[PDB]
Amino acid sequence: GLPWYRVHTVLINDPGRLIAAHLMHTALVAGWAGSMALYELATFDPSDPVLNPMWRQ
Amino acid sequence: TLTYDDIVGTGLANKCPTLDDTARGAYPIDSSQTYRIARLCLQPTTFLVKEEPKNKRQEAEFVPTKLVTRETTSLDQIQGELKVNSDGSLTFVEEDGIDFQPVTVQMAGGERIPLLFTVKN
Numbered sequence: 001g002l003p004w005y006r007v008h009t010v011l012i013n014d015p016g017r018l019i020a021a022h023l024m025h026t027a028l029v030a031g032w033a034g035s036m037a038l039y040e041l042a043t044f045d046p047s048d049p050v051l052n053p054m055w056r057q
Numbered sequence: 058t059l060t061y062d063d064i065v066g067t068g069l070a071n072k073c074p075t076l077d078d079t080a081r082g083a084y085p086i087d088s089s090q091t092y093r094i095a096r097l098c099l100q101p102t103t104f105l106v107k108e109e110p111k112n113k114r115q116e117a118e119f120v121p122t123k124l125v126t127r128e129t130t131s132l133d134q135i136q137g138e139l140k141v142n143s144d145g146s147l148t149f150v151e152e153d154g155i156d157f158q159p160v161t162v163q164m165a166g167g168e169r170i171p172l173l174f175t176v177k178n
C-alpha cells in the first residue's frame with residue numbers, strides 16, 4: 001500500500017477532495033488565529049503600555 | 058404634576074427636579090428668620106475613578122467608568138437645618154434622608170468599583 005509519507009498523494013487526481021483538504025487546512029489556520037487571539041486576550045495586561053507593552057508579555 | 062403611575066418604570070424616579078431657564082432670580086435671606094432645606098436631591102451623572110499608576114510618581118488621572126447597577130444612584134428626600142451665621146454665610150446641617158446609595162461602576166478592562174455614594178452628616 002502507500003507508505004506513511006505518501007498518504008496525501010491520493011489527492012493528486014481528485015480536484016474536489018484536494019479543495020476539501022485545502023479548505024480543512026484553511027479552517028485549521030483560521031481556527032489557530034482565533035484561538036491564539038483568545039488566549040492572548042485572556043493573558044494580556046493592558047494597564048501599562050509604557051513599561052509593560054504587548055512585546056514584553 | 059406627575060403621579061406615581063405616570064412615573065413608574067420611566068427612570069424619572071432617579072432624576073432630581075429641575076428649574077426653568079427663567080429661574081435666575083434671588084432668594085432673600087432674612088437674618089431673623091429660621092431656615093431649613095425641606096428637600097435636597099443629588100443626581101449623579103458621572104462617576105470618575107482615580108487610576109492607580111505603577112511608578113507612583115506619575116500624576117494620577119480620574120478616568121470614566123460604566124455604571125452597572127442601573128438607575129438606583131440618586132440621593133433624595135434629604136432634609137436639614139439651614140443656619141444663618143454671624144458673617145452672613147449659610148450653613149446646611151444634614152439631619153435625615155435617603156442620603157446614601159451603593160453604586161458599582163466598572164473600569165475599562167472590567168475591574169469593578171463599588172462605593173457608598175453618600176452625603177451622610
Ligand code: CLA
Pocket residue numbers: 002004007008010011020021022024025028
Ligand atoms: C491539515 C491537516 C490534514 C488534512 C486536511 C488531512 C487529510 C487527509 N488525510 Mg492526513 N494526516 C495529517 C493531517 C491532515 N490530513 C497528520 C498531522 C497526520 C499524522 C497523524 C496525517 C496522517 C494520515 C494517515 C495515516 C492517512 C491520512 C489520510 C488523509 C486523507 C483522509 C482523511 C484521514 O484519514 O485523516 C486522518 C488524520 C487524522 C485523524 C489526523 C490526526 C489528528 C492529529 C493527531 C491531532 C489530533 C486532533 C486533536 C483535535 C488535537 C489534539 C491536541 C492535543 C493538545 C491533545 C485526507 C486527504 C488517509 C489517506 O487517505 O491515505 C491514503 C490516511 O490513511 N492522513
Ligand code: CLA
Pocket residue numbers: 004005006007008009
Ligand atoms: C505547501 C506545502 C507543502 C505541501 C502541500 C506538500 C505536499 C506533499 N508533500 Mg511535500 N514538503 C514540503 C512542503 C509541502 N509538501 C516541505 C516544506 C518539505 C521539507 C520538510 C517537504 C518535503 C517532502 C518529502 C521528503 C516528501 C514530501 C511529500 C509530499 C506529498 C505527500 C505528503 C504526505 O502524504 O505526508 C504525510 C505526512 C504525515 C502522515 C505526517 C507528517 C508529520 C510531520 C513530519 C510532523 C508534523 C507536521 C506538523 C503537523 C505541521 C505544522 C504546520 C507547519 C506549517 C509547521 C504531498 C504532495 C512526499 C512525496 O513526495 O510522496 C510522493 C515525500 O516523500 N514532501
Ligand code: CLA
Pocket residue numbers: 015018019022023026
Ligand atoms: C470563478 C472565479 C474563481 C474565484 C473567485 C476563485 C477563488 C478561489 N479559488 Mg479558484 N478556481 C477557479 C476559479 C475561481 N477561484 C476555477 C475555474 C478552477 C478550476 C476548477 C479553480 C481551481 C481551484 C482549486 C483547486 C483551489 C482553488 C482555490 C480558490 C480559493 C483560494 C483562496 C482562499 O481559500 O481564501 C480563503 C477563503 C475565504 C477568505 C472566503 C471565501 C468565500 C467564498 C468564496 C464564498 C463562497 C461562494 C461560492 C458559493 C463558493 C465557491 C465559489 C468558487 C468561485 C470558489 C479562492 C476562494 C483553493 C481553495 O478553495 O482553498 C481553500 C483551491 O484549493 N481554485
Ligand code: CLA
Pocket residue numbers: 008025028029032
Ligand atoms: C505559509 C504558511 C504555511 C504553509 C506553506 C503550510 C504548509 C503545510 N501545512 Mg500548515 N499551518 C500554518 C501555515 C502553513 N502551513 C499555520 C499558520 C498553522 C496554524 C498553527 C498551520 C497548521 C497546520 C496543521 C495542523 C497541519 C498543517 C499541515 C501543512 C502541510 C500539508 C501538506 C502535507 O501533507 O505536508 C506533509 C508534511 C510535511 C511536508 C512536513 C512539514 C514539516 C514542517 C515544515 C516542520 C515540522 C517540524 C517538526 C518535524 C515537528 C514539529 C515539532 C513537534 C514537537 C510538534 C503543508 C506542509 C499538515 C501536515 O503537516 O500534514 C501531515 C497539518 O496537519 N498546517
Ligand code: CLA
Pocket residue numbers: 026027029030032033034036037
Ligand atoms: C476573510 C478575510 C480576512 C481578513 C480581513 C483577515 C484579517 C486578519 N487576519 Mg486572518 N485569516 C483569514 C482571513 C482574513 N483575515 C483566513 C482565510 C485564514 C486562514 C489562512 C486567516 C489566518 C490568519 C492567521 C494565522 C493570522 C491572521 C491574522 C489576521 C490579522 C492580521 C492580518 C495580517 O497581518 O496579514 C498579513 C498578510 C500578508 C502579509 C499577505 C501576504 C501576501 C503574499 C505576499 C502574496 C503572495 C502571492 C501573490 C499571488 C503574489 C502576487 C500578488 C500580485 C498583486 C503581484 C487581521 C485582523 C493574524 C492575527 O492577528 O491573528 C489573530 C494572524 O496571525 N489570519
Ligand SMILES: CC1=C(/C=C/C(C)=C/C=C/C(C)=C/C=C/C=C(C)/C=C/C=C(C)/C=C/C2=C(C)CCCC2(C)C)C(C)(C)CCC1
Pocket residue numbers: 028029030031032035
Ligand atoms: C463548526 C461550526 C462552528 C464552530 C467552529 C469552531 C468552534 C471552530 C474552532 C476551531 C479551533 C479552536 C481551531 C484550532 C486550531 C489549532 C491549530 C491548527 C494548532 C496547531 C498547532 C501546531 C501546528 C503547533 C505546532 C508546534 C508545536 C506543538 C510546538 C512548537 C513548534 C510548533 C509551532 C511547530 C460555528 C459555530 C462557528 C459555525 C459553523 C459551524
Ligand SMILES: CCCCCCCCCCCCO[C@@H]1O[C@H](CO)[C@@H](O[C@H]2O[C@H](CO)[C@@H](O)[C@H](O)[C@H]2O)[C@H](O)[C@H]1O
Pocket residue numbers: 038039041042043166167
Ligand atoms: C465562540 C467561542 C468563544 C469562547 C470565549 C473564550 C474567550 C476567552 C478570552 C476572552 C478574554 C477573557 O478575559 C478574562 O478576563 C478576566 C479579567 O482580566 C480574567 O479573570 C481573572 O481576573 C478577574 C479580575 O481580576 C477575577 O475576577 C477572576 O477571578 C480572574 O480569574 C480571566 O482570567 C480572563 O481570561
Ligand SMILES: CCCCCCCS[C@@H]1O[C@H](CO)[C@@H](O)[C@H](O)[C@H]1O
Pocket residue numbers: 041042165166167168
Ligand atoms: C469570542 C469572544 C467572546 C469573549 C469576549 C469576552 C469579553 S471581552 C474581555 O472582557 C474582560 C473583562 O471586562 C477584559 O478583562 C478583557 O480584556 C476582554 O478581552
